[PDB]
């Protein structure tokens, strides 16, 4: 087979020494890499920029003529990644080299056989501030028809977090938008946790961290991201090879999804970033 799917809740990706490089989610589709040796115990695979090995125990072969395989497609305006059969995200502008309605395949969403994408928000240094003001960030709720968000009118708090912790406020808004459905998830409402931060704070079990109010949620999550990611050399969203996505999420397209939201917000607010 050319394509395999991850069977368990998560599975590790290893290097040739057997060292753990990253982990990926159930249902993720990996490509067999024909330039490296596979055996019955481990397959040489690629996923989200990462070339490594996975245990055959963790994988199921797919048939591309009947099983969903992620792909990219242009509508003539934007280029979309189908991350699931019924879910696409805009990743780039249409290029003249793209045939509209043709499915394209890529292990990193950057290199295609007939064209090359810039995904600049995916690799942007997150310690550089946004050019959007608090009031501009606050406008995006109406421009994207975001209703009943706890993050409505919190632009000033995002900008405070950016001033204090030196973490891009557009990124913070986009990350919170993706992880908590714009501060509308049950975890957002119960625990003021907009960024999917888990800890062992209140229960003997792994649970969403609790923050006291919306502002302390935004500032506390930013502090946590600074201390656990930025300060430890994960300074861009990235993918399974580099950046925050290596550790932050099993979803191999977590970084791409947040970059997509940054792209959409940036377009609606006039392209300052
Ligand atoms: Ca190694």
From Swiss-Prot:
It comes from the Bacteria. Transmembrane segments: none annotated. One of its GO terms (molecular function) is amidase activity. Keywords: Cell wall biogenesis/degradation, Hydrolase, Repeat, Secreted, Signal. GO terms for biological process: cell wall organization. Its main location: secreted. GO terms for cellular component: extracellular region. It is found in: Secreted. Belongs to the glycosyl hydrolase 73 family. This is Putative endo-beta-N-acetylglucosaminidase. It comes from Streptococcus pneumoniae (strain ATCC BAA-255 / R6). The lineage of its organism: Bacteria, Bacillati, Bacillota, Bacilli, Lactobacillales.
């Amino acid at each position: 087979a050319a394509y395999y799917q991850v069977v368990p809740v998560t599975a590790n990706v290893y290097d040739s020494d057997g060292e753990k490089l990253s982990y990926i989610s159930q249902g993720s589709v990996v490509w067999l890499d024909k330039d490296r040796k596979s055996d019955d115990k481990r397959l040489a695979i690629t996923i989200s920029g990462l070339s490594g090995y996975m245990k055959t125990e963790d994988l199921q072969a797919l048939d591309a003529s009947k099983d969903f395989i992620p792909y990219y497609e242009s509508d003539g305006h934007r280029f979309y990644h189908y991350v699931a059969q019924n879910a696409s995200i805009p990743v780039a502008s249409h290029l003249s080299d793209m045939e509209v309605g043709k499915k394209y395949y890529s292990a990193d969403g950057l290199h295609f056989d007939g064209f090359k994408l810039e995904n600049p928000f995916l690799f942007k240094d997150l310690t550089e501030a946004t050019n959007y003001s608090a009031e501009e960030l606050d406008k995006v709720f109406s421009l994207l028809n975001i209703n009943n968000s706890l993050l409505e009118n919190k632009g000033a708090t995002f900008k405070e977090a950016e001033e204090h912790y030196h973490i891009n406020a557009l990124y913070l808004l986009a990350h919170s938008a993706l992880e908590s459905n714009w501060g509308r998830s049950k975890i957002a409402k119960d625990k003021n946790n907009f960024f999917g931060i888990t800890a062992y704070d209140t229960t003997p079990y792994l649970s969403a961290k609790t923050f006291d109010d919306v502002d302390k949620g935004i500032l506390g999550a930013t502090k946590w991201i600074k201390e656990n990611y930025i300060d430890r050399g994960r300074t861009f969203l990235g993918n399974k090879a580099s950046g925050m996505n290596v550790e932050y999420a099993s979803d191999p397209y977590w970084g791409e999804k947040i970059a997509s939201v940054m792209m959409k917000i940036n377009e609606k607010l006039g392209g300052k970033d």
